[PDB]
Design a protein around this ligand. Sequence first.
Ligand SMILES: [Fe+2]
Length: 608
Amino acid sequence: SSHHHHSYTVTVATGSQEHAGTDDYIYLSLVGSAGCSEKHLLDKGSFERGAVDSYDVTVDEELGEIQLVRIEKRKYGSNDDWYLKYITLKTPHGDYIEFPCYRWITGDVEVVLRDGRAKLARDDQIHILKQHRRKELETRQKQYRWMEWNPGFPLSIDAKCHKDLPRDIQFDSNTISERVMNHWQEDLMFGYQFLNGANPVLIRRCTELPEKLPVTTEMVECSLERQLSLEQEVQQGNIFIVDFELLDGIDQFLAAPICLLYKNLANKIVPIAIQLNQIPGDENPIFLPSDAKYDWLLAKIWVRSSDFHVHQTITHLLRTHLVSEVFGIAMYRQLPAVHPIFKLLVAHVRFTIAINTKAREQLIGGHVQMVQRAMKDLTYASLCFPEAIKARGMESKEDIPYYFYRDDGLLVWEAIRTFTAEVVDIYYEGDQVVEEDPELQDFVNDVYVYGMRGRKSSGFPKSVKSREQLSEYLTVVIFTASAQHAAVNFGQYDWASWIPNAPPTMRAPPPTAKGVVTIEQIVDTLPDRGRSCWHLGAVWALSQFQENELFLGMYPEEHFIEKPVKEAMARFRKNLEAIVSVIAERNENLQLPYYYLSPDRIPNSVAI
Ligand SMILES: [Fe+2]
């Protein structure tokens, strides 16, 4: 499939995408240290999918060391876009030089490629390179611009529809759901989803009963099993609470449930109380598992309903999609392609801007009110996975044994943390070098000022001044964009296919009295078939891995070409293979297996 044309040996790899090929004319210059060359027009034909064509380009004069490669596409009828993977040169001196690309080339403008080796701003002293760096950012900084889609939202790409985006970022039943069908009425299943379900990030250990939940030991006598009072079971750390105060005030109904939970003698977490709204009172009853059958159950259906909106809106859309797009745009604006941090993150922002852009145009009022309020909650510390687990009081595995999200997550986290630390070391000699990287700082500073609206209380670094800190910053970007998204996105069908376990909408208001609810008003309180059909299709489509799916650590596009960083990639891959094995054996001795955070099921980016 490799076509050779017959003094420089110019190899041109074309992309394997559906439209990757082109038929226009392709002119290719070389820019050495001793002077540029002439524009050699590739002789004939068209470059089609999966192609690798090599040309022998003779030059009149010695060019010295090669610094840049120029590409220019002149039309042959309607402009057929062309995806260039990479360009390699075999110079007459015997040198081999790889020029990575991975960019669509419309032919509107020239494309100048640097050497494959990653360079910082400080590594470039000759004018030839400095000017290219500076004109690359200038073209970045006007193609990828910021724009506030909704008030108080994180700023996003300045583009209304998909095809407005630059061409380089444009897009080209179950084992668990069955079990949720035969058990969703069990307090065990209900509580289990708070740890190993689609949205396992809300539960927190309780250290004192809220005053807005006037629950007494007598009401939960029958649920407690340690012969202790509710007040004392809280001290021992056996009470857990899930509070939806984020929904209080949102504008065919909503609720603000407070759900109290208990770690029984089986070290399982089951529900023992449910108050569907925030302000207690006699028309806001505290439902109990000892209440009438259809009361305690409709009480749990509302908690499911609420957990599903917070999941999709906040846990899913805001804290993964919108957050990755932020890092994504910042990366394009401030980091030239030759920058080591670019080469690393460019694979974890792949398609995020395009997938989001698609969601915004197709989607289109109460769910905008949740983001604004979530927005004040979003903090850099809340995205560092270890701390985020610890802030919620769920760190102890001896006290909280069955928390697979936390267990697998902490593994994947420190696997990525190890990678970035290594890669950071291969390119930054000392902390001084980090603090002085002018483009790295402009990257951090865009995330903080435009992404996070410059909100001082978000905890995002205004600047990065150490290798430790840069490694943490990078791990937060790669982790949130891959593992964290994989855990909250790929469960939407396993846990939300069966409607009574994740009602997208509720047709009736929450019950205000006990002994009234009947199976009939539960059925008609649940969503319509038309709403259910759309919901079923949406959750199934968003839980499907594409056939070209690139999983964590798959870097088929070689932006990195040096051995030190490839080796660090090798270790990263092997280290992920160890976590896949461990997660495999654990899920062997499990009732119903948790696998969303297995690295061979963790996409590279937020793509769906
Ligand atoms: Fe998603």
